[PDB]
Amino acid sequence: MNLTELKNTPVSELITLGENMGLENLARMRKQDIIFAILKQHAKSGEDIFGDGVLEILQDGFGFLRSADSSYLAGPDDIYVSPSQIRRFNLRTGDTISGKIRPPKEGERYFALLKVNEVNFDKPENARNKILFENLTPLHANSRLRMERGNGSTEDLTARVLDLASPIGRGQRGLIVAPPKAGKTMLLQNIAQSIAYNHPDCVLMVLLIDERPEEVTEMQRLVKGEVVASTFDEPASRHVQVAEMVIEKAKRLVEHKKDVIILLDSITRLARAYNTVVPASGKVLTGGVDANALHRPKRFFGAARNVEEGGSLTIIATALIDTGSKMDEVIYEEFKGTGNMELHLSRKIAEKRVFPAIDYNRSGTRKEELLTTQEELQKMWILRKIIHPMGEIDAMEFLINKLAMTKTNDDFFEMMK
Amino acid sequence: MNLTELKNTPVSELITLGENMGLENLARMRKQDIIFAILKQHAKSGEDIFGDGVLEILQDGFGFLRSADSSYLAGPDDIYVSPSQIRRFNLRTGDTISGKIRPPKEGERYFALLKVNEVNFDKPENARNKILFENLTPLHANSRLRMERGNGSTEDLTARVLDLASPIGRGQRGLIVAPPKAGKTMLLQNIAQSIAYNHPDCVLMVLLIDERPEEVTEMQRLVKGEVVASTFDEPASRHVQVAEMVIEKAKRLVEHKKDVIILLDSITRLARAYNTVVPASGKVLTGGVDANALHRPKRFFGAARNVEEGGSLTIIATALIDTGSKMDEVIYEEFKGTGNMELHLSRKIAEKRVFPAIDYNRSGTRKEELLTTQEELQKMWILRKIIHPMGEIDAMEFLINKLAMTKTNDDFFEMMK
RNA sequence: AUGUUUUU
Ligand SMILES: Nc1ncnc2c1ncn2[C@@H]1O[C@H](COP(=O)(O)OP(=O)(O)O)[C@@H](O)[C@H]1O
Ligand SMILES: Nc1ncnc2c1ncn2[C@@H]1O[C@H](COP(=O)(O)OP(=O)(O)O)[C@@H](O)[C@H]1O
Ligand code: BEF
Ligand code: BEF
Numbered sequence: 080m081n082l083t084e085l086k087n088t089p090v091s092e093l094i095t096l097g098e099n100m101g102l103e104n105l106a107r108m109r110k111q112d113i114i115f116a117i118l119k120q121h122a123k124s125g126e127d128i129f130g131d132g133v134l135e136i137l138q139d140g141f142g143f144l145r146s147a148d149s150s151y152l153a154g155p156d157d158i159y160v161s162p163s164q165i166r167r168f169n170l171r172t173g174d175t176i177s178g179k180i181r182p183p184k185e186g187e188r189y190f191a192l193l194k195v196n197e198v199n200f201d202k203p204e205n206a207r208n209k210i211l212f213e214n215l216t217p218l219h220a221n222s223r224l225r226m227e228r229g230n231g232s233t234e235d236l237t238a239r240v241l242d243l244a245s246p247i248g249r250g251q252r253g254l255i256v257a258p259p260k261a262g263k264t265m266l267l268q269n270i271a272q273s274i275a276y277n278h279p280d281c282v283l284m285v286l287l288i289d290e291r292p293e294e295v296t297e298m299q300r301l302v303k304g305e306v307v308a309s310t311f312d313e314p315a316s317r318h319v320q321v322a323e324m325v326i327e328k329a330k331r332l333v334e335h336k337k338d339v340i341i342l343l344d345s346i347t348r349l350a351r352a353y354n355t356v357v358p359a360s361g362k363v364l365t366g367g368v369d370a371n372a373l374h375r376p377k378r379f380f381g382a383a384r385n386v387e388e389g390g391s392l393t394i395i396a397t398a399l400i401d402t403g404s405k406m407d408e409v410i411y412e413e414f415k416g417t418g419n420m421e422l423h424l425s426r427k428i429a430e431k432r433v434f435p436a437i438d439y440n441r442s443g444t445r446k447e448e449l450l451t452t453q454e455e456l457q458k459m460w461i462l463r464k465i466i467h468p469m470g471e472i473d474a475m476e477f478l479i480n481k482l483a484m485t486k487t488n489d490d491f492f493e494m495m496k
Numbered sequence: 497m498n499l500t501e502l503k504n505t506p507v508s509e510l511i512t513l514g515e516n517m518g519l520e521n522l523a524r525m526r527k528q529d530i531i532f533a534i535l536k537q538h539a540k541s542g543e544d545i546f547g548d549g550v551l552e553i554l555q556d557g558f559g560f561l562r563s564a565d566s567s568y569l570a571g572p573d574d575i576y577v578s579p580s581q582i583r584r585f586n587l588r589t590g591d592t593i594s595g596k597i598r599p600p601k602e603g604e605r606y607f608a609l610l611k612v613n614e615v616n617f618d619k620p621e622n623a624r625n626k627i628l629f630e631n632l633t634p635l636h637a638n639s640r641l642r643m644e645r646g647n648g649s650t651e652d653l654t655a656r657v658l659d660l661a662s663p664i665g666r667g668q669r670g671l672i673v674a675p676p677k678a679g680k681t682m683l684l685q686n687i688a689q690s691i692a693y694n695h696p697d698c699v700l701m702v703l704l705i706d707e708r709p710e711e712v713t714e715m716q717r718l719v720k721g722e723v724v725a726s727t728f729d730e731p732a733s734r735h736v737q738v739a740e741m742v743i744e745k746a747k748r749l750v751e752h753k754k755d756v757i758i759l760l761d762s763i764t765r766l767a768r769a770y771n772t773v774v775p776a777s778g779k780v781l782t783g784g785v786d787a788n789a790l791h792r793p794k795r796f797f798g799a800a801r802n803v804e805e806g807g808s809l810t811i812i813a814t815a816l817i818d819t820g821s822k823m824d825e826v827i828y829e830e831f832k833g834t835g836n837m838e839l840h841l842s843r844k845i846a847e848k849r850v851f852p853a854i855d856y857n858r859s860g861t862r863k864e865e866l867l868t869t870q871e872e873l874q875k876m877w878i879l880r881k882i883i884h885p886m887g888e889i890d891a892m893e894f895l896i897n898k899l900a901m902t903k904t905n906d907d908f909f910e911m912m913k
Numbered sequence: 914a915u916g917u918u919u920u921u
């Protein structure tokens with residue numbers, strides 16, 4: 080008796096099971112209400128019920144166990160967590176809790192937690208003694224997260240160009256700067272697919288705030304990982320809540336020496352949401368940005384770091400420029416002094432239908448020698464010195480024509496000499 | 497005895513009928529008052545009266561049935577809908593209701609609804625069980641909505657250029673960016689005529705907010721569809737109300753697997769209206785735009801989506817640029833990074849009296865391979881690569897001179913090779 | 914109202 084197991088079951092089988100259990104007509108009923116009635120009827124027989132979810136401690140002291148399939152939205156099937164157990168096990172926002180639950184009695188509206196069985200997918204004896212995320216020693220990117228497929232596919236050209244322009248390692252904090260209508264969607268899809276193919280052990284999390292739902296359901300059915308999104312039909316409060324829950328879960332996972340990867344596509348939208356939810360202080364800067372509005376996105380971005388004791392946190396955010404709004408322009412670069420990695424995309428190259436439209440000149444990675452060998456770094460330096468004199472479109476055409484001849488970049492580097 | 501039937505009748509015949517029924521002199525009376533008196537006299541004999549309209553639920557709990565011929569304006573002949581029936585049939589704003597009505601008794605001012613016969617042009621048993629619009633899975637444009645006439649007319653050149661620049665499919669969410677005095681009116685008229693000619697099965701709705709009455713009555717007598725407009729003589733409150741009613745009706749139609757097409761021509765004017773009706777919060781951004789003013793137009797724009805279960809919602813809005821106001825430059829923009837189709841028009845080409853004055857270079861459609869075949873996409877790519885080096889005016893002249901030689905674009909593509 | 918917008 081698990082909550083996620085009943086959530087994954089279809090509607091027809093749940094209706095059939097409820098009709099066999101002998102309850103009210105479930106055809107004219109919601110799936111969540113059907114599951115609730117089935118759990119009630121199964122607990123009336125004396126059997127136990129189990130559930131799971133991410134903890135969201137409220138300001139009063141209690142909390143609930145949000146579900147991932149609903150993008151951490153307030154649902155009727157949330158498991159109530161008393162503050163006594165929180166104080167007894169030192170629980171915090173983001174801790175994954177899995178234990179026995181019971182249906183609400185007369186006068187209650189949510190399931191109660193009796194005994195916790197597993198904390199953060201581990202024993203509670205290992206979670207009671209742990210080092211906080213704020214005390215971990217940061218470090219630079221040491222492990223190399225190669226994005227090249229290696230299967231010789233035609234779509235691998237984007238990953239090869241990305242590796243030649245800006246290699247990505249564990250704990251990297253980069254930025255994907257690109258004007259609208261440049262190809263950010265396809266680039267993010269390719270990055271997510273390459274991460275899921277090359278490094279399936281890492282925890283991939285794609286955050287899409289204030290996006291077109293069709294794109295949400297497309298990304299959810301395309302990438303092999305977790306997708307937490309919030310369409311534009313929701314207020315900025317839900318955006319802030321989702322961002323906080325995601326970053327808290329990422330911190331709790333990193334605290335257990337896990338490799339978390341966050342592919343953010345709405346850093347600008349997140350900053351707009353934070354500027355909308357912040358109370359007015361009577362002081363407005365140039366472009367309509369509050370003085371204390373960028374602090375929360377600043378911390379959300381800076382949360383990414385590489386841990387020496389174990390694990391890492393990678394955050395790749397895509398910033399929006401040339402959107403016609405001065406607020407986004409002020410945000411983007413305020414954040415430019417940030418992202419230890421900038422991958423610029425050119426609109427002029429995208430208009431020529433030359434995919435990918437990557438600005439190789441302005442791209443780059445700091446401390447790239449820690450992720451590449453000596454000969455590889457020398458070859459990349461020679462390639463950059465050869466590409467720099469040529470124009471952007473000409474350099475992109477040259478790179479595409481030279482990478483189409485071979486499958487691996489090593490052969491291209493060997494033929495360049 | 498139908499309301500719309502009496503509304504379509506002329507004034508002279510209604511006056512004659514009222515004089516034959518033996519009532520007060522109807523020559524010095526309004527047509528609506530004449531219809532009201534005729535309905536009263538006909539109901540005094542014991543016969544039944546029927547009406548219809550779009551439901552507009554008020555904040556208190558009751559509602560009225562607005563009429564389409566009055567642009568959903570508050571009229572004396574609105575049918576009152578009690579909240580009891582709303583609670584009994586789960587009615588919402590936008591549901592088309594058609595049932596028996598009765599004249600108001602002593603102390604009443606509006607017609608009452610006794611029994612509902614048809615809901616959303618369908619049986620109530622099919623409307624009681626339905627999936628909300630917020631739960632439908634979005635998708636990209638799959639079905640091709642070809643705009644080419646095919647009759648070899650001289651006006652078909654605009655549709656041919658539009659198809660070669662940006663093909664339109666079901667569920668598309670585009671933008672027509674053009675400075676003033678460019679030819680937006682003729683272009684919108686041609687688009688509406690091509691939609692009514694090629695795809696007469698789709699529900700066409702043209703929304704004109706804050707425009708001149710002459711243009712309104714011109715569009716109403718030119719296109720073959722529904723025209724809901726609101727001239728500048730009305731406050732922004734009526735603009736917001738009309739936009740809400742139109743989008744709610746569109747959502748209710750899409751919920752019944754219908755293909756709705758909305759040709760918006762005032763996205764900038766709608767954003768200005770929303771910025772005017774929003775209460776001041778003491779925080780003004782660059783250009784005079786409120787922080788929470790663009791949220792409602794953002795949702796109105798993002799409502800457009802393609803449904804996998806059935807139906808679609810297409811919204812083609814025309815944004816205004818270079819109007820001398822910085823608010824529109826932020827308002828029209830901020831919207832640039834939202835849609836997935838931009839059809840730019842050049843003022844320099846319009847000054848040369850070269851119609852249509854379309855910027856073929858900056859135009860385009862994302863995921864265009866889902867609406868065109870392989871050979872068609874290759875021919876469009878070759879045409880774009882040939883047109884790109886030439887200047888805007890030169891490319892437009894070349895395209896016009898090459899399309900004037902033949903009737904179909906297939907012959908042009910075959911002759912280009 | 915200052916900042917924002919004006920504004921480069
Ligand atoms: N690698 C690519 N190959 C082919 N087309 C692409 C590629 N990247 C982008 N595009 C085209 O650009 C359009 C928009 O790209 P997108 O990633 O949505 O840009 P952004 O996210 O910056 O708005 C897509 O619909 C696609 O047709
Ligand atoms: N396809 C066309 N053919 C001929 N003249 C046109 C065409 N499109 C626009 N025009 C001219 O431009 C004028 C204004 O066009 P309009 O569509 O009103 O531009 P906008 O809507 O951008 O203000 C029209 O009065 C018309 O004379
Ligand atoms: F319009 Be893109 F997604 F920035
Ligand atoms: F003056 Be146009 F209608 F934009």
Ligand SMILES: [Mg+2]
Binds near residue numbers: 263264
């Ligand atoms: Mg995008």
Ligand SMILES: [Mg+2]
Binds near residue numbers: 680681
């Ligand atoms: Mg116009």
